[PDB]
Each structure stands twice: as structure tokens, then as C-alpha cells.
Amino acid sequence: MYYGISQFSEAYNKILRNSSSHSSCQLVIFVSCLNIDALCATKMLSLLFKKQLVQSQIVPIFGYSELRRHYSQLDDNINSLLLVGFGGVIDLEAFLEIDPQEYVIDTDSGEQSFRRDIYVLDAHRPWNLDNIFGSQIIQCFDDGTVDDTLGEQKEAYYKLLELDRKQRKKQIHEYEGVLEEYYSQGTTVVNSISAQIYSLLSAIGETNLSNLWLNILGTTSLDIAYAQVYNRLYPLLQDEVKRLTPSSRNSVKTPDTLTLNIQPDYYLFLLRHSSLYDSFYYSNYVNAKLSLWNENGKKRLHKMFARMGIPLSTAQETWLYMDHSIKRELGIIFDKNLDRYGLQDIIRDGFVRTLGYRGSISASEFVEALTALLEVGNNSAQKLTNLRKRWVSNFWLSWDALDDRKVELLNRGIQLAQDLQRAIFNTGVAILEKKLIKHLRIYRLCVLQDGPDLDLYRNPLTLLRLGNWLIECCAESEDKQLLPMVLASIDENTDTYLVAGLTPRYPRGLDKKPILNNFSMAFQQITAETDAKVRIDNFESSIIEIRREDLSPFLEKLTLSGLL
Amino acid sequence: KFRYMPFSPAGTPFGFTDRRYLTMNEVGYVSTVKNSEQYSITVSFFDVGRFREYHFEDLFGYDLCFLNEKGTLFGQSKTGQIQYRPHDSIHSNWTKIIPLQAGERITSVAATPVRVIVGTSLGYFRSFNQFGVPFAVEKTSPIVALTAQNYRVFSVHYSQFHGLSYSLSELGTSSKRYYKRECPLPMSLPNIKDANLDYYNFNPMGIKSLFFSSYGDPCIFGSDNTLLLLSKWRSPEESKWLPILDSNMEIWKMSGGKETTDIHVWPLALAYDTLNCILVKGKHIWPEFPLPLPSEMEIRMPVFVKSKLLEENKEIQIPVSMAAEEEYLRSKVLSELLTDTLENDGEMYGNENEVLAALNGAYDKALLRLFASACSDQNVEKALSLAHELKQDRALTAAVKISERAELPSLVKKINNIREARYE
Amino acid sequence: ELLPYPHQLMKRLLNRISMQSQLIENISMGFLDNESKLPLLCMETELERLKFVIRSYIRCR
Amino acid sequence: NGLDTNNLSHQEQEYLKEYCDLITDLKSGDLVDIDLSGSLVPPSDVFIDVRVLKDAGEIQTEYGVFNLIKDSQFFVRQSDVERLIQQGYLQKI
Amino acid sequence: MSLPAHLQQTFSPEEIQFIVENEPIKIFPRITTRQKIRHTRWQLITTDDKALNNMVAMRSTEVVLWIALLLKQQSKCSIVAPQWLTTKELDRKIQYEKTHPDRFSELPWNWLVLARILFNKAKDDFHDPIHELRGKIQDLREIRQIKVLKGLKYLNESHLQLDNLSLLEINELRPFITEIMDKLREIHTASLT
Amino acid sequence: IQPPLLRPLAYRVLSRKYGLSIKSDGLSALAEFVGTNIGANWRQGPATIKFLEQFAAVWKQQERGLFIDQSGVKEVIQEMKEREK
């Protein structure tokens, strides 16, 4: 709203006018650590700033309290502050207690100018009305969907701000009702931060194949959470790939030759890097369809391989080492057998960027390797701070792996993704056998006391991966009602349960508005009411840390909460 | 009979490729890429500091593209749709459709800082302002090619009965003038191998490019590839075309006697005394979508005899006298053009006057070499004629020294008389 | 063998370096107050290379 | 010293201190414009990305203060970051 | 000491690269640094400033190779490929070396370093494909190495002549050849009465 | 007093001289010391150079700009200058 999508390049030009100086480094960039879309957007922005030669600093951030503490240490020489993938939903000016009058310089002439300007980007469509409108130092970026939805909201909000009689009471009540209808709504992502940065780069004309690949990776990270948004973005990415596609086609192989290929990308687990059978085994959709957590599901997978006619050993053999003719026949075999088993949804299209002898890599496998690098790239509050520093180091490691020269780093991320997905599948099968998930009819409650992977689930990425596997199982299971899910894992050292909200999703065959997440506001109300300690410092409000004993009374209050 | 097709300067046919250069010039090279029958358009700018590149998908697939620093022109000849996008784009990129009769198509287009030029295969001409307001509607001979260097405009009109012709105009911001109107063009059309035939299908005239010089003098690169420049164009009565560069002869001389067919020449613009031209190789006359840096070639007279050069060859060698003759001719033409440009257009840079003085000195040196050759011939009359043609009396001092070296008393006496006359 | 020390050439180069550094400082003050720092970076790199060459020769001596 | 005392003799330690003083004195005076203690590697790269090998914190520059928070990358001229690299705080971006 | 022990005898490959950078090279500008008669200036103390200040877009100009590469880092500069750095010229040099095993092809002393640097940066500017030029450079390097092996087989204490040998090859061969020749000269001197 | 004005000056005079880190707070403290003289104290610049040299000789510690030790070192150098007077 405050900056139109067409005006994003104008805001970048203003940032250049404010902080572009060979004499001094007057720019600073803040990015929410352990966010794939924010990481891709920050990489594109850093490349653009390097082309602009404007010196700047990059500091990954884990939570809102960390962001406030970082803002406390900001240098006055920096006249511009940037936020990537966070702070849109909240009123950052209210959170940081910023004063436009204190910041405003040369306010008079009807021109607003501040010593430090704050630019905000966030994937979630919901944005605090005060953040979008109230704060001028905050300059929210939107695709125009926020403006379209907030026409009436901004009319009511400005009318309420102006309004201070029974008729006046009725008008103020109407404005408050519109504002509240905008409020108390489950947060949802409608656009990718990488997509917004790519739109700004297209307004500047600066978009290239690498930037398009980064935006595609951000969209692919979004894909599991919002398949609908991924479907909306995929045709645009294909059009961009066609526009930027080199005129030469079927070019002779050489290491320098690089191109992005729009090719089928089946819903399988690292099929290029993992054996065919294991790629089928680690697929959440495959497990959710065949009930692979059961030995009956494993036997169904074996029978499907037999019906396909590939030897079971051939499927279990490494895909790179598999036979050349079988690789070409795999597409026809899939088209024949996935329909027979009803798993035809596995067939899918995905961008795969190639570079000569370095070869082609799918966006899904790259995003999986990046998530693994973020998860495992390396007094209890001090230990959590050290772990957040380790998470920032993992974010830096993933950023370094984003460089093409760090193909070995990307491969290490791929191996870590294989290990993490194996652990997630084992934990999910064990949880299904244990029936740890409980259908409370207000939500689905699950708490983890298992020794393995608890320290991994203390990482929100691994916790969310396990939750996504369970959600895929529940979504493919028609008998399982689509309900909000609660996942609570506890690390013994901190002795606190990491509770994160999980909205239900439709089965991959189905494609209905996604369920809004009430867990954020529900946990906020439950934390305000309950004496049990709960952490909201993290940028993800749904994710929360609560002590081991604190969780159970908090869980009772959560079931009591009407928001869920 | 002749086929009327849209013409864009340095335009490249799609051919086998789905993508092609819509037009190319020193201001920038425009390349369109087919995208599901909607040809995406990219507008590259050679001056990176002056302009930022902008690429936009085009469902129209405008077959006509003209590039000027004020803005980029786009046009679909069959539909008549014409879109003009200012380079700053602060003014909205206006688009409009022109009335095209059955069988009428836009043969070419041109851009002006304050106006937009439109020409039709039927010969109808429509003038529009920079805001798109039609400033004039007219009918003329079919303008096969349109070129406009800022306010200056140079067009080529052709018909089966009218023949090759060209109209020159300096419209200016006001007081529009036509320096020449459909004056006959002395150029030869290509005969109508397969790649050359396809290039003829793309551009029936065969003109590789029609463009003004960096100083604004009219120029063109015909199908024969021998570069032509309109000398003394400021005076219409004394204006004359000059085959300033023979690209085929230059290619042969650089090849050293070898005859290469795959090599070609493709000019985007002509710098002063040097053509900024890509030398397309391979079967295709037009260059590939990737753009090699243009080859800069100084102007070369066609006076060189290929048979004499081959006899010298027995990496090509030229006689010193032939080199001096070509040098003196080129220097005289360049000095006349520089004098006209400095008199009328002034000096865009202050070094032009010093360059003209150095060119006069080099012309005098070439004349002195020719005078030494005439002394070797022992023709005192020819040597005296060369000395009379010499521009500077200071160079005539060297001419008299050369006559003394030739030990011709008649030449020395005539040179002394010429020294007295020049002193007078 | 150590070469004889060229005092005049070394002193002229040092004076040129001093004047160039002073001019670069003046340009920096003006910028802090056309505006293109690319020539300033070129001059800074040239001064750095010249100073490195002089220091290497002096260290070898 | 321009930018294991037990192993050295006492006279050797005094000699090393005198040598460091002599180096500082040679830089302190004539030819002070060029840091004689500066690296002898040719200036191959004018600009190079830099990030902390260690979390030293704020650091000085020609006209800026840069945080050295762990794994924090930068884009700066090589000359300004040469001293920080000599300190070892930042390595290879 | 002030001089590293390895640097006491021969220049480093980076130093040879610095010398090659000190050499000039032609390039095509994309900025009208020249101002019309109708601004920051280089004012270089070790090199010409007039060429840089007079550069215009797509107007070929020569500048020191280090400055040329610095500008090529930006999109404004496109380096002009050396004429000897063409496939035909490389084939001619290879044929000359084949016809003359004793005589090295008249390549520039910095031919190897220049080809490597251009492959690192100026690979785009080459009209000929970079891979063919790299293969030709490797073939020429192998031929020159075989010739160097034969010459080392034919060493003499008095002197040696290497006309067209690359500067990088000379720098690499300086330690071994110098030490061997010095030892042979010492042996001959001890043999002398 | 005028810490921003002395900042490039202090940065040069200290970091170029010894490689010692100068904190912004230490530069501000040196600015207050400079402003202790009502007018510009150019001799105090050489006094600060002598103070930095004495600090390097005694403490021999990097990051002397933290100014917790540099303030006491400034008092010591001022007493030394008073004894010199």
C-alpha cells in the first residue's frame, strides 16, 4: 500500500539516494534467519546492492526481541533499514516504540523525511493496519492485494483515527467493526518475498536467470504450505523462464553452458540424488496414500514396483547408478502405474536449472538441501542464544551454498536433507503407531517425549518438517478431519516444549481456500491468561517455547480457548 | 514483382530461430523473443549510463521497431498498431492503430524527438507528434525505409514505376524543410544463396541498414554492401553520393587474397571516419542473437584494383602510389565533409577543427608522395599539377625540396613561381 | 649488487604522491559536503600501486 | 609487530623489541605516507567481500563502524579490510 | 627478512600477472567520458588520463590491462581480443612450432598469462569459442614444454638463448636452470687450474 | 566536543600509527578532552599522539579505544605534560 509494486523500484532508488555514498556505508539489511524465501530475497537484494557498489551490512535475525535488540545497536550513519520476510503482520513501529517526530528531519514544505527509514517486507498477506498506514518511517511493500483488501479497512481506520453523540457512537462502532473484521483473522501468505524482489527487479529490468531461479526457490519453499499460491506463481515463473531463456537450444555440452529448464518434477524425495525406491519411501504424499507407515503400506509399495515391472533391486539401487534405458522409461512407467495406484498426483512440473557438466538441479531438491543446511548447518537462555547464533551460522552456510561455486556445500545440504527426512519419516511412523496425536475436537494435540530427534525438533525447521509429514498423512486420510494440529517437542537441556501451530490442509489431489491459522492468536491469549511461561520473541508467533511442566496446564487452557 | 515488407534498421529475420533482432542501432539493439506466439521484446542500450535496459513481453509482436534516445517506436505493419515508448517513459508509452487499407502495410517507421514518422506500402504517409497527435496525413511513393537522426529525417521511397528514390528532410522543432524529395537513389537491388534468399524475403530491398552518420550526414548500407554516403547534402544542388567504403573489397584485402563467403558486414552506425559494424559470419547474413562487439573500420576508397593487388600478392600488398592516391582522395573527402559539418552543424566536440587541420596535413603528405611518384615518372607537368593541388605552401616547401631531389629544373622553377604566387 | 640511489626521481615521485593524496583528500571533503567517485577510486588504486612499488624497492635496498 | 618469549634469550627479546621500535620509527617520519608494515602482496583486488572469522564486534573504517557479528558478510575495498584481515578477525568474506 | 626466501631468486606468478596488468590492452567503452563542447577525472600520475577521459561508448581505446579489467568488472567495458589470440593465429603458431621444433613460435612472453587471464574474464569478448582457444593454448604449451625438455637435454654452462619463450615459462625455469648452470660453472671453475 | 570532526583525524592518527582499534566512544572522549580547551587545540593533537604512544608502550593492548583505560591513560599523559611544563 505505502509503496506500490510498481513503486518498489522507486523505493529502491530512494534507498540509493539516502545511503549511496563511497565515503560511508549508510545501509543495513535485516533478514529473519531460517527463512528460505527471505534468504532468497536477501541474496537477490545483496547482489543488486553489490552491483550498485553501496556498502551495507547483513545480520540474520531469529526473533522479534532479537530484532528490537539489534535496532537498539543501530548506527546513525545508516540512513536506511530493510526488513525481509518479517514484521509485516505486526506493527513494527509499535513493537520498537519508534517516534516519527524524533526521526523526522526537514519535515517542513509538505515533505516527510527521516534520519533512518524502515522498509518492511513480509510474505504473509495480513499486515497490521498501523504498520501499513500509521507509521511513515515504516514503508510497507505490497503486491496490491493488501491495498485491494484494505481499501475499506483504511477508510474505516482513518475515519476512526479522525473520530474522537449516539450517531458518532454508531460511526465509531462501524469503524471498529471493520477494523476488528480485518483483525482476528488467521495469518496466511499470499505472495513470496522473493517474488516481490523479482517484481522490483523486473521494474528495474535487472531480472536474470539466476534471480528467476532464486524467486523460483522461494516459491518452491512456499509450495508445501500454500500449493494454491505455488500454482498461481508457477505460470509466471514459466513465462519468465521463457522470456529469459537463451535463443540457443539443444546446445552442445560444455561446463559454461547454463540454462533453466521447465521440466516435469515428480513428487518424490530427491529422486535424482536418492534411489528410486527410497525416493518413493521418503515421500510424504506416497506414505500418506499407501499408508506406508504400516508394513501393509510398504508391501503395497513393493507390489506397485512389481506392477511397474522394474526389479525391486533396480528401484532400490541409487538413481544415478540406475540403468540409462530405465531412466528414460521411468516417465512412461509412472504414467502407467501412478494411475493404477491412484497416485497420479505425484507427477508434477518443476523448474530445473542446469550448468553444463555441473548439470541440472531441481528447485525442490535445492530447497530441501537449503532447509537441511539451515537446520543442521553446525544459563538455558544463554544456551538458546548460542543456538540462535548457530542458526544464524546455518543461515550463512545456506547463503554460501547458494553460490554456484559452493556445490559441495549444496551436496552437504542434500545429504543432511536425506538424514533429516529419514529421521522425520521414522518419527512420523512411530508417532502414527503410538497415536500420540489426539483428536481433541478443538484441535489435534501431540506432545513429544521421545529421546531421538527432540533436539532436532527444538529447531523449528525440523519440528515443522515432522508436522508437515503428519499433516500430509492426515490430509490424504479422508477419515481424519481437517483440524488444527499442535506439535510440542522438548529439549531436555532447556526443559521447555516448543509448541508450533499447524493448520490443516487438503489432500494433494484436492485443490478450496486454505485453513487459516488460529494458533497464533490462541497461543497469545493463552499466554496472557496462563501463568505458564511462553515465548513469543520468535518471528513466528505460532511457534512458542513453554516449560515442560508449563505445557500441560497451557494445553488445557488451549483446549479451553475459543480461538481454536 | 517487388514485395512490400516492413523494414527496420539492422533488422534480423527470425528464420530458424524463434528470436530475432527487431532492430539495431548505436542507441541500442532490440531483440524480440517468441514466447508462445507472443514475442517478448527486449530493448538493450549500448550507453549503460544514459539508459537502463527494459524488456517487456509483446503479444502484438510488433514487426517494426525504431529506437531514438527520446523514445522507442514499435509497430505492427499488418494490424497498423504503433506503440511509442519514451526512453525515460515519464510520458506514458502511447499506442495507436493507423488506417490500413486491404493490402496496406507499414513498410518502415522512424522516431523524432517531437514527432513520429509512419510510412505505408501503399505510400500513405502519416505524421504524428511525440504525444501521438497526428500532425499530418499524406500520400507519397512507398517509403521503403525511414531514418531520422533527431530532427533530421532521411527516407527512401520506391515503386515499380517511381523506381529507387529518397527524400531528405530537416524538420527541426519548427520550420519543417525537405532538403530532397524522392531524389533517385543510385543503388542496385539484390538478385533473387538460400540464406541470402531468406534475407531478401525478410528485406526485399536488401538494405542491411539505413542510417544517418554520427555527424548526421545521410548514409546507407545497400545489398551490394558497398557503403554509400551523401556528400555535400547541405547544398541540394551539389549533393552527391560517395561509395566511401567497399565492404567486399575490405573483406578481401583483410583476408589477404582469400575469398570468404561466410563472412559478411552488418553496420549499426557510422562513427566519424570509422564504421561501427558487426561482421556477420556463417551462412546467415544477419547476426546471431548474442551480439559480438561491432568491428570498427575506417573508410577505404574503391580505387584499389583487385587484379593489381593479386599481382602484388603473387596479407595483401598495395603499391605505395596507389596507397597515396587512396589516402589523398579519402582525406579530401573527409576534409570537405568536416568543413561542411563545422560550418553548418558546428562542432559537437572541439577536437574536430584540430582533426581537420591534421587531415589537411595528411592530405598534403599524400599529395607530396604522389608528387614524388610523378617526379619518378619525370613528368614535370604532372608533378606541377600535384604541387598546385597541394593545399599548404608549407607543404609546397617540401614539394620544392622533392623537386630538387628529382633534380628537375623546370619543376623547381615552377615550384618557385608557385611559392611567389602563394605569397601573393 | 645494490643499484645507486636515484634521489631526484625518488623525490619527484614522492612529491607527486603527496600532491595526489592531498587532492584525493580535498575531493573527499567536497564529496562529504560532478559527483563520481570512480575517478577517485582510480587515483586511490594508482597511489596504492605506486606506494607498494616504492616500498618494495626500498625494502629490497 | 609492524601491525614465545621463553624461546628467545633475554638479549634476543631486547633485540626484537629494538627491531620493532626501529620499524615503527622508519614508518614514523619520512615515507610515512605508505604503511611500510603494509602487506607486500600486490593489490590484485580493489574490492573484496569480507565477513568475520571471529565475532570481534564493532570495527573502525575510513568513515564507518562495522559490526563483526559472527558470520556477517560485507562488500568493501580490500585496502580498508587489509588491517582487519591482518588482525585475523575477518577471513574471505 | 624483508624478502621472502622463494622471492629471493624469481618473481612470483602473481608478480608476473601484475607486470602483464601493467601492459596495456584495447577495449570498447560504453560511457561517454568525453564531454561535448555544448565532471570527475582520472588524473592518473602513472598512466594517461586523456584516453580514459576521452573514452566514448563503443569507441575502441587502449588502457593499462589492470584498469581495463577493473572497468570490465563493470558492464561498461568490453575488452578487445588480441589478434594473435585467434584460432587461426594459434593454428599458425602451432604449425610453425611443428615445422620448427628448434624454433619457438613468436608468441608474446606473456602469451600464457594473458590467455589465462582472458579466459578468466574476457571469455565473453572472444568471437571464437573460448574452448577452442583453450585447447590451442594447451597444445602450444605442450609443444613448448617438449622443446624446453630438449633444450634442458642440450644445456651448456657458457650461455643459452630462448627467444620466443613465455615470460611465465622463463620465471618457472629460472630456479632450476639457474641452479644447475651455476653448479656446472662452479665445477668447471674448480676444474680450472 | 566535535567527535565527528575528530573521528577521521583520530582514526588516522591512531590506527594508521599503530594498528590499534579506536572505539567511537573513545573518539568521543578524546573529543571532550579536545573541547576542554575552548578553542581548537592543535598542540593537543600531538599530545594525544604522545598519549597513544605511551599507552602502547605501557598497556600494549589492542582496542585501546574502549576508553575505560584510555581515560586514565589520558590523565597520566596530562600529568606527564604538566611535569614537562
UniProtKB/Swiss-Prot annotation, chain A:
A GO-annotated cellular component: CMG complex
UniProt keyword Phosphoprotein, yes or no: yes
InterPro entries: CDC45 (IPR003874)
Subcellular location: Nucleus
GO terms classed as biological process: DNA replication initiation; double-strand break repair via break-induced replication; mitotic DNA replication preinitiation complex assembly
Any GO molecular function: single-stranded DNA binding
Protein family (similarity comment): Belongs to the CDC45 family.
Note: Present with 1730 molecules/cell in log phase SD medium.
Role, per record: Required for initiation of chromosomal DNA replication. Acts at the origin of replication. Also has a role in minichromosome maintenance.
Assembly: Assembles into a complex with MCM5/CDC46. Interacts with MCM10.
Protein name per the record: Cell division control protein 45
Gene (name only): CDC45
UniProtKB/Swiss-Prot annotation, chain C:
Signal peptide: none
Location in or out of the cell: Nucleus
Family assignment from sequence similarity: Belongs to the GINS4/SLD5 family.
Protein purpose: Required for DNA replication. Functions as part of the GINS complex which plays an essential role in the initiation of DNA replication by binding to DNA replication origins and facilitating the assembly of the DNA replication machinery.
Known partners and oligomeric status: Component of the GINS complex which is a heterotetramer composed of SLD5, PSF1, PSF2 and PSF3. Interacts with PSF2.
Identification of the protein by name: DNA replication complex GINS protein SLD5
Organism encoding this protein: Saccharomyces cerevisiae (strain ATCC 204508 / S288c) (Baker's yeast)
Encoding gene per record: SLD5
Shown stretch of the complete protein: 75 to 147 of 294
Swiss-Prot record, chain D:
Residues spanning the signal sequence: none
Subcellular localization, as worded in the UniProt entry: Nucleus
UniProt similarity note: Belongs to the GINS1/PSF1 family.
Subunit: Component of the GINS complex which is a heterotetramer of SLD5, PSF1, PSF2 and PSF3. Interacts with PSF2.
Protein's job: Required for DNA replication. Functions as part of the GINS complex which plays an essential role in the initiation of DNA replication by binding to DNA replication origins and facilitating the assembly of the DNA replication machinery. Required for the chromatin binding of CDC45.
Additional comment: Present with 1431 molecules/cell in log phase SD medium.
Protein name per its UniProtKB record: DNA replication complex GINS protein PSF1
Organism: Saccharomyces cerevisiae (strain ATCC 204508 / S288c) (Baker's yeast)
Residues represented out of the complete protein: 105 to 208 of 208
Swiss-Prot record, chain E:
Gene Ontology CC annotation, any one: GINS complex
Keyword Transcription carried by entry: no
Gene3D superfamilies: 1.20.58.1020, 3.40.5.50
Keyword annotations of the record: DNA replication, Nucleus
Protein family according to the UniProt entry: Belongs to the GINS2/PSF2 family.
Subunit structure: Component of the GINS complex which is a heterotetramer of SLD5, PSF1, PSF2 and PSF3. Interacts with PSF1 and SLD5.
Protein's name in the database: DNA replication complex GINS protein PSF2
Gene: PSF2
